[PDB]
Structure formats: structure tokens, C-alpha cells
Amino acid sequence: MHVVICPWLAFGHLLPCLDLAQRLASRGHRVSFVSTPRNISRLPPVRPALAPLVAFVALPLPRVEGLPDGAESTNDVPHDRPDMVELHRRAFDGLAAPFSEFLGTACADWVIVDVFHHWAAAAALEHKVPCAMMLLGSAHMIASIADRRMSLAERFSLTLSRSSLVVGRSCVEFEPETVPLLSTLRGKPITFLGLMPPLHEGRREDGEDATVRWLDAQPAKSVVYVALGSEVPLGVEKVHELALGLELAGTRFLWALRKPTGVSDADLLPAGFEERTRGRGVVATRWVPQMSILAHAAVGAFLTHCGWNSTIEGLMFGHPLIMLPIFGDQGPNARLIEAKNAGLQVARNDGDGSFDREGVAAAIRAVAVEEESSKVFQAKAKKLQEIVADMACHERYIDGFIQQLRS
Ligand SMILES: C=C1C[C@@]23CC[C@H]4[C@@](C)(CCC[C@@]4(C)C(=O)O[C@@H]4O[C@H](CO)[C@@H](O)[C@H](O)[C@H]4O)[C@@H]2CC[C@]1(O[C@@H]1O[C@H](CO[C@@H]2O[C@H](CO)[C@@H](O)[C@H](O)[C@H]2O)[C@@H](O)[C@H](O)[C@H]1O[C@@H]1O[C@H](CO)[C@@H](O)[C@H](O)[C@H]1O)C3
Ligand SMILES: O=c1ccn([C@@H]2O[C@H](COP(=O)(O)OP(=O)(O)O)[C@@H](O)[C@H]2O)c(=O)[nH]1
């Protein structure tokens, strides 16, 4: 088959879509990976053996006054500048005509579109190509969308209405409580393509990255890795509470931190924090090799925002989770793993959802420091790792997904 894949302009979408493209090409399918040029330029390289089977189709983002040239992804357009989020949405929707032109002559068997691709779904209908909508999260999250407790909701609803199939990233082995209960979303069949845990070969990072050389100098399971994915906002006041919570709990840490918009370098972290913690902690204000870090012997707990990629990556390497969900599917993901006893959420105010250094330190202590509770979280995370890291199981689910596309 020729499968056209259209990821949302966000690294939590681009990365698993690139892995799915290579899983399809590995089984002898042709893939057109449709995105914007700077986003494509920032992706890990395709395996040389698959080079002719994964075609990158670069559609330039239209120019929108006030949207920087090159600001193509949610990693570039900050959530703390909602006016720019809106300009990026307008630019994204401007891809409609170039995409429809491409699809007309593509000889596509399937279009697989992401959560806001209402125009790509419209093009699939126009060109009589079946359309699958990606909702590459947990079964628990898909259940939440079915029973929740243009606007974003309208963009999603319209994309779903024009699709024939909804694609989740889980399996009955991981969510036996939920997967058997799900049949349809807006009357469209739900299919699960497994957890699709990533591969080092697919995420080609540097094993000589400064963060990995620092981890090399720390003893086994001694380091709390801290990362909140590629896009969620965390304002400077919240950065300081997270910093001081890490300091007070006293563990070694490696922290991949994105800067809030318009915050000075001198203001980013608490006064003297970097000096006081220099001996036990590293803050990297750049993209880090997360797969190399989570695969590293020095990492024990993972302080995660519970993005679905990070949840799967943490558990595939048997890390218990210290969970700080920010938006979207992160709350449901955090509650799902808490219910599996493999991590604990940082306390949040029942009112404004705020956290402080005491809540951060208490969660770190419970998961990573206190002998008895940390031992149990570690054992429970290892039980989940048995399911998450079963690569043969998740490859069988990809085969099943391809059979669904045929049927
Ligand atoms: C009904 C809904 C289900 C929902 C679940 C999460 C989901 C959706 C966003 C669809 C795409 C996948 C996914 C997993 C996601 O987070 O992707 C993720 O979506 C992100 C964008 O959110 C992307 O960037 C990521 O790449 C992507 O993975 C999905 C659709 C909209 C959602 O609800 C809407 O959440 C907005 C959040 O905004 C977000 O709020 C954040 C603060 O919390 C801001 O930082 C952020 O800029 C803003 O977009 C909020 O501002 C609106 O008020 C609210 O809509 C209102 O909901 C009410 C209750 O259901 C209704 O009664 C109202 O009629 C309805 O208008 C949220
Ligand atoms: O410094 C970073 C930050 C993130 N990631 C990767 O970016 C993805 C983040 O996706 P997730 O669903 O966890 O969160 P999102 O960014 O969508 O909020 C994961 O595959 C991470 O491995 C990375 O490699 N380095």
C-alpha cells in the first residue's frame, strides 16, 4: 500500500509518525510523510535501508504577518503567546490547497491524518482515499473524549466526522479495563495499533551528548530525569517551584527545561540554585537525547509531564514516574499510571491546580528516596516494563493495524 501520513506540527506527533512510517516501510509499504520543511529537517534520519520507501513531502507554511519564518511547530510557537498560537493555526490551515493538489496525483491507498487535519480529511473525501484519524494516546484518554468532564474542540470534531477509522496507541494487555469497552468514537471504529515503543535506531541521538557523559559519572539508579516534553508551558514562577522542589528532595537530577517566553537567563532559575546544585544536578535548556537518557543505568525515577510518548519511553526502561501533568491527555495519562501503582502525581491545589516546592519534594521522596515506597514503585514500573517493552507483541499489533487498513 501507499500510505500518506500527516502529523500535527508538534514533536510529540512528528516523532511517533516517523516511527510508524518506518514500521510500515519495513513491511513493504510506501509512505509519504507530509509536513513543513523545518519540521522535516529536524527529524531523526530514516534507516538507509528504507530511504526510497519513505518520501518526505515538504509543504511550506504560508507567511502570516506576526508569525516568524521558521516558527513551524508547537516547540517554536509558545502556548504562553496565544496570539501566535492563533497565527500558526491560520498558517497550518493554509496547507489545505497544496495538500489536496499533492494527494490528487499521489496514488494513495490511505491518508492517516492528525487530530486537527480537518482539511486533509476533506481532501481524502474529494480524492476518494479512505482516511484514518490518529488519536495516538491511551485507551483511557479515548474513553475520556467519548465522555468528557473554529475552536480546538470544533477542529477536532470536524476531523473526526470526516474520518472512517480512529487509531489509538495502546493494547488490551496494557489497558484491559478500557480497551474491551471501546467500539466507536462519533460512530467511527476505534482500532489500537499497540504501544509502538520507539527504537534507538529510529531516534538516532549522540551517546557523547554532554548530558549522557554527565550520567556516565553517576551511580546506578541515582538520577531523577526531569522533562516536560516539547511544548507544554511552565511559567517562570512554576519553574522556580520545580527547581526548589528538586533541590530540597536532595537527589541527583538531569533537567531538560524549556524557557518561558520573554524570561531573562538571570531570572530563569532561583538565585544561586545552579551554584548550590552544581555537584548533583544539570539543567539543559536545549533538546536532549531523551531515549539515550531513559536507557541509561544512572536514571532511576522520571519526573514527567506524562505526555504519552514520555510515559511509554519511561516505562519501556522500567522507570517509576513522578507525574506533573500540564494539559491535554497528560492528566488522564498520569491517573492511568497512578492506578497501576507505578508512579505518583505531584500534589495540586483542588481549586487552581497549582503546585509548590513542598509538593514536588514530597513526590520525589515518595517515588525515589523513601526505601519502602520507592522499592514498591520500582517493582510496579518493572511489571509494566514487561508489557511496554514486549517489542514482538507491539510488532504483532502493527501487523494487525495493517490488516485493518486492508479490510
Ligand atoms: C473537548 C476537548 C477534548 C480535548 C482533550 C485533549 C485532546 C484535544 C485537544 C484534541 C487533540 C488531542 C488532545 C489529546 C490534546 O490535548 O492534543 C494536544 O493539543 C494541544 C493544544 O491544546 C496541541 O498543542 C498538542 O500538540 C496536542 O497533542 C481535545 C479537544 C478539545 C478539548 O477541550 C478544549 O481544550 C482546550 C485546551 O486548550 C489548551 O489549553 C492549554 C492550557 O490548559 C493551553 O496551553 C493551550 O494553548 C490550549 O490549546 C480548551 O481551551 C477548550 O476550552 C476546550 O474546549 C471546550 O471543552 C468543553 C468541555 O469538553 C466544551 O464544553 C466546550 O464546548 C469546548 O470549547 C480537549
Ligand atoms: O528534550 C527533549 C524533549 C522531548 N523529547 C521527545 O519528545 C517527545 C515528547 O512527546 P510527549 O508525548 O512526551 O510530550 P509532548 O511534547 O507531546 O507534550 C518524546 O518522544 C521525547 O522523547 C526529546 O527527545 N528531547
Half-sphere exposure of 153 (CA within 13 A, CB side): 3
Which of ligand 2's atoms lies nearest the C-alpha of 205? 24
Ligand 2 mean position to 128 CA, how many Å?
34
Q: Where are the alpha helices (DSSP H) in 234-329?
A: 236-249, 273-277, 290-294, 308-316
Within 10 Å of residue 285's Cβ, how many Cβ atoms?
13
Which of ligand 2's atoms lies nearest the C-alpha of 284? 1
How far is 256 from 289, CA to CA, in rounded Å?
Answer: 10
305 is in an annotated binding site: yes
287 is in an annotated binding site: yes
Architecture of domain 2-197+390-406: 3-Layer(aba) Sandwich (3.40)
Experimental method: X-ray
Would the CATH topology of 2-197+390-406 be identical to that of 206-388? yes
Looking at ligand 2, which residue's alpha carbon is closest to its atom 20?
Answer: 309
214 is in an annotated binding site: no
Nearest ligand to the C-alpha of residue 286? 2
Resolution in angstrom units: 1.4
Ligand 1 mean position to 328 CA, how many Å?
6
203 is in an annotated binding site: yes
Looking at ligand 1, which residue's alpha carbon is closest to its atom 64?
Answer: 153
Domain 206-388 belongs to what topology? Rossmann fold (3.40.50)
How far is C-alpha 153 from the chain's CA centre? 20
Q: Would the CB of 400 count as within 6 Å of ligand 1?
A: no
Which of ligand 1's atoms lies nearest the C-alpha of 145? 3
Hey, where are the domains in the chain?
Answer: 2-197+390-406, 206-388
Long-range contacts of 208-213 (CB under 8 A, 24+ apart): 209/288, 209/289, 209/292, 210/284, 211/254, 211/256, 211/282, 211/284, 211/288, 211/289, 211/293, 212/289, 212/292, 212/293, 212/296
173 touches 385 (CB < 8 A)? no
Element (H, E) at 90: helix 82-93
Nearest ligand to the C-alpha of residue 289? 2
